[PDB]
Amino acid sequence: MSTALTHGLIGGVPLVLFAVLALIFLTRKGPHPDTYKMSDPWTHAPILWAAEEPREHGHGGHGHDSHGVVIGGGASGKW
Amino acid sequence: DFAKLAAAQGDAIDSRYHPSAAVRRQLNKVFPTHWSFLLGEIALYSFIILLLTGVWLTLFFDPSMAHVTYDGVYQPLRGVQMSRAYETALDISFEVRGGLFVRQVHHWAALMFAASIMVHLARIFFTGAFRRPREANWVIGSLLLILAMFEGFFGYSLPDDLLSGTGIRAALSGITMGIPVIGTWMHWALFGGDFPGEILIPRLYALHILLIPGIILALIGAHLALVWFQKHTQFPGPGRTETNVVGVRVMPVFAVKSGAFFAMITGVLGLMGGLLTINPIWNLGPYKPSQVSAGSQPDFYMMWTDGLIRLWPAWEFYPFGHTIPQGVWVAVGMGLVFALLIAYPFIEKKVTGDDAHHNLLQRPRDVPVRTAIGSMAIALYLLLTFACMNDIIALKFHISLNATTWIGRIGMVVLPAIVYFVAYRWAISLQRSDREVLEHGVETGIIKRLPHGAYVELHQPLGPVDEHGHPIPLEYAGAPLPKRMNKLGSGGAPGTGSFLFPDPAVEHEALTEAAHASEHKSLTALKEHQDRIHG
Amino acid sequence: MHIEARLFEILTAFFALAAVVYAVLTAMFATGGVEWAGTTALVLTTGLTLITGTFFRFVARRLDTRPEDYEDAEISDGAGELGFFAPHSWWPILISLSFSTAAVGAALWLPWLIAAGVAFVITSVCGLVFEYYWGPEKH
Amino acid sequence: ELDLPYGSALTSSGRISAVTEPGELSVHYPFPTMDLVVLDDALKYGSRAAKARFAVYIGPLGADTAATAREILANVPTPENAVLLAVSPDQRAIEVVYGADVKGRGIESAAPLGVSAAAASFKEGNLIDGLISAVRVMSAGVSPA
Amino acid sequence: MSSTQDRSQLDPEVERHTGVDVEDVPSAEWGWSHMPIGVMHIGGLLSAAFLLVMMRGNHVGHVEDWFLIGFAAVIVALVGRNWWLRRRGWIR
Amino acid sequence: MTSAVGTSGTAITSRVHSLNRPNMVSVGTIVWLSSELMFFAGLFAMYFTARAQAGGAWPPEPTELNLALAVPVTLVLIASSFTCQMGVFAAERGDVFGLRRWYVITFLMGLFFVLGQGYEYIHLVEHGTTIPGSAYGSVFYLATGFHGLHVIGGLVAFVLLLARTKMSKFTPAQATAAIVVSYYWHFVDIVWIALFATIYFVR
């Protein structure tokens, strides 16, 4: 029945339903926290990030010891 | 008195000549004992067998297109017009005792010669046995491979046959005559006129028994002399450096094992000449331009050229009042293949920048880009080789002939890329496996920790162990690492009695203790030599 | 292994009952007597579970209560040397490929590709089995 | 001693087996996943050239900013060759600290450059972009040992 | 235990300071390990072009042309994805 | 590498300590044999359906079973099972060479059984009955020849295990391997007893 009508239906109804469901669901606030604004106070706990970039002797924790902080300079700034 | 005779002959040799120093140098020359270094010896031995069988075949073969009715012994071909070449090939097969065996082992030796040349080329390319030194050795080896290919091409074409004559008509005639500026001129000068010219087989006979084999012998002499005096390179190892050769001396061990390997290779070739049928020319009727079969393939070494012919998509150009047939495409493709193969070491050095004198091979995993390129090239070669066989592949494995042709056409640009990517990543992952073994030790059976339910594989470090459990990671040294305690001193001392019955405990203990002492001595000698060299 | 054996014992009881009732109700009340296919299949699946359960019961009587079987078993009780579990190995893929080359040889009736797939399978099974027993190369 | 408010328990070994409610996350970082990925890319391979562990500390570093920077650097896994950039927006302060092995490799010259990039980006109003810019500048400045 | 560690000094000679690094290819110093990405991108583009060009031929068939189109399309898609990701710094 | 991080004298050992625990290899082998029982159950179903649909004379007129050659082969298979169990006892002990002797004679007798089955196959084929020739011929050949393939697999397992014992020192791992190979051989001989009682006696 109406070959063109059937083809258009099978090709479009899935698309229309997909669009509707995407509008319903993909347009909902996710669980990811919103980006931190500079004006707002820093509420999150301290965040220390490290590269894990170089090789660290052996993976074994023991034997690393604590040679020292061995500071090697400094800097400062105020935005 | 054999000892007296030997001493007297040695004195006579050293008095007539003075070969003591040179002979001692040859006997003391050290050769690495890696199996992959026997791949060239396979080709050399197959070449020797080829020569020995070819002399026998020449004693009975008559090259000529002079037409003759068979009137021989093979009934299914009697009274049929055939050339003297075909008639005498049939005579070798049937009316000469052992002639069928000799020609079959000759053809099998040719196939093994090509295959072992290909495997040796793979070995050297993947291990980098061509860079800075030995690059000219690689060049002449490439020439040798090309000569071997065309030598086999003329060989299986020598007995004027339906299959081989059809192959000649395709390649030698069509490709030669399609070449634009001088194609017909080369065709007429090779064939002494039109395709069935009465001198083709005599000319190929000369080329195949004297000219090309003479050049192959000269180039093999140059190859072996270069390997001999440019001491064989070796894989990185305990005592192996760029300025030494660790292995076994020529006289006691290397010579005997090389001779034994020659014996075993010729035994394999003879067994296959007996048990497996190669080129049944009696089944393949005499060449006639009007007759043809469906197979129509060349030997596996020319199968890639034939597959290129099949796959290339019928692109022809017609300049002003002229034609440029599709044969020129495949001719230029072969030219490019050979040029790239011959010039790879120089291409590689130009690209990377390494002109350092390299005597230590590099594992194919340690060179991801080159192993990837070699895998890509081998994939393309296999694609072409199976494209040439698409007829029988389609026939037996039920796949439409058009489907096989287009699978080849698409793959020859898709499959090389896939294999390149896969081989590159595979090499890098082999490197990663080596590094993990270096930094964690070999893997073993799992153990459940006492207090808690932790599971730990209970590795075994390959180097000094830190004060705590974890070891000090070692640095990769370009040499294979043992990834199974199987291959280390772990569970390797079965009762040394026999397969059916034991031996006395005293004898078993003596034998095993002596073996362990010998292993300790060998490892200590290697360790001390390594320390002395690097310290 | 009491529960492990009793599971198969229960399966054996049920499958034996099913085989017996099927055989009886097919010998009588069927169009052509015993079906002889379902009957045999039920009898030999009863045999399957019977073999497994008998072995499990033998082992249960042969072994003292394992920590795994013992309720109130601490982790430390079972803590110890677990046996050899094969680490990385590339022999399984080769075995699969060899068996696939035998299977295609059987499908496309190619005795030569059957013969080679079987050779291939023998070689790869030998490799897998000898993987952790090939002593160090003796030169 | 006290584990997380709910569902986290100390295990037979040291590791703490923690849980999160089905609908919520664990990291809770207040930055887009893509920008976190970009910063991680920087710290990971844009610093590989420096061959010195580059670290970022967004937390608040109060009291003597310099000294708190020193000890949070000490908390870095390998302070010997490390470069810690600490930003406290609660104090609008930047502090960069370096390890002894990270000396004379252009780090000291790059210090003002990295701090200036971070400050410029922050006054523009992009904490994460400033952190990335500072990491890039400092990594470019620092030469491998 | 019945294994001796290996000491190797291979002659080196690009100096590898640019291109690939050991963290990415552990044996970078031991052999050719870096193929410029432009080479692979151009190779993929030319392979796709060759596949498309093979459509022009003496074949009355059409599934052949469609297979060529599909394979060229996936090759071009892979090349474009790689180029875009590297342009943006391996994002998305 | 001081001595070893894994304090074991065998790179490969028993997958669990079998004295207090079940042998995993044995458990897996028993389960797989119980599955092969169902494979042979399918074959038996085929044979029994053909038997039921036969018109009274189950072995057609052309076919005639040769008990003279079928009784010696089954007796030899039973003897092979007994020798395999003796080899199992040797393996339970540390008797590497006793296990090797017992398994070698078991392999020889299994090969004799295979050759006898092949001889009976040749005789039967010569005297008419064939796989395509008749339904009886086909079901009989499928059943008995699949069993023969299983026997060949057992022979391969025997030679392979013997090679393993040659190449590595005898340990509980190899003892368990011998035990499971013997389990396979016993299953093979049991299914042969079933097939013999069905084909020849029950008919």
Ligand SMILES: CC(C)=CCC/C(C)=C\CC/C(C)=C/CC/C(C)=C/CC/C(C)=C/CC/C(C)=C/CC/C(C)=C/CC/C(C)=C/CC/C(C)=C\CC1=C(C)C(=O)c2ccccc2C1=O
């Ligand atoms: C019906 C019919 C006609 C049937 C016959 C078929 C036919 C026509 C021909 C085949 C018949 C024959 C004659 C077959 C046997 C061929 C033959 C000579 C086999 C020899 C192998 C053999 C019998 C070994 C016995 C075992 C044993 C005690 C061995 C140690 C003593 C021996 C024989 C040592 C031989 C050493 C050897 C192979 C020397 C080859 C000489 C040549 C050409 C090169 C030497 C050479 C080698 C070998 C290198 O590997 C190499 C590597 C790197 C750089 C340089 C070299 C180099 O110069």
Ligand SMILES: CCCCCCCCCCCCCCCC(=O)O[C@H](COC(=O)CCCCCCC[C@@H](C)CCCCCCCCC)COP(=O)(O)O[C@H]1[C@H](O)[C@H](O)[C@H](O)[C@@H](O)[C@@H]1O
């Ligand atoms: C070395 C091998 C590896 C190659 C790697 C490259 C991978 C890319 C493969 C490209 C596949 C191209 C397939 C298309 C090709 C094409 O264009 O041809 C068609 C036929 O389509 C097809 O089946 C398509 C089948 C595609 C399956 C490809 C399978 C890949 C396998 C080979 C991979 C395994 C490799 C094993 C490696 C072994 C390792 C050895 C060490 C139509 O022919 P035709 O039959 O005349 O159809 C007529 C109608 O059209 C018409 O309406 C109607 O009227 C009729 O006339 C009808 O006949």
Ligand SMILES: CCCCCCCC/C=C\CCCCCCCC(=O)OC[C@H](COP(=O)(O)OCCN)OC(=O)CCCCCCCCCCCCCCC
């Ligand atoms: C079956 C497969 C087909 C058969 C395959 C065998 C043929 C040979 C294989 C591959 C050749 C192409 C290699 C890749 C070439 C690299 C291009 C490049 O961009 O140059 C970079 C380099 C690194 O320099 P770098 O200081 O390490 O800096 C790092 C920068 N990222 O520069 C250079 O020195 C070199 C610049 C010029 C190189 C010219 C090489 C080709 C010469 C003509 C021969 C024909 C080639 C045929 C190609 C198939």
Ligand SMILES: CCCCCCCC/C=C\CCCCCCCC(=O)OC[C@H](COP(=O)(O)OCCN)OC(=O)CCCCCCCCCCCCCCC
């Ligand atoms: C996911 C896609 C899913 C696509 C799935 C579709 C499957 C349906 C295919 C065949 C069904 C049986 C029909 C069999 C007969 C064919 C139909 C027909 O007649 O269609 C008209 C003309 C030819 O006219 P002709 O009279 O045949 O004569 C001609 C010369 N004499 O073709 C056309 O324009 C229309 C094209 C018809 C088929 C082309 C399909 C080939 C491959 C598609 C892409 C491969 C992608 C590879 C990716 C790496």
Ligand code: HEM
């Ligand atoms: C150098 C490498 C060589 C290769 C790869 C090679 C290859 C072949 C092959 C494949 C054949 C076909 C045999 C057949 O179809 O039965 C053949 C034939 C022949 N070869 Fe060679 N050959 C080589 C060297 C030689 C040598 C050195 C001689 C002479 C000493 C020779 C003499 C002959 C003769 C007379 C025939 C004709 C035999 C026939 O028609 O059956 N060949 N060759």
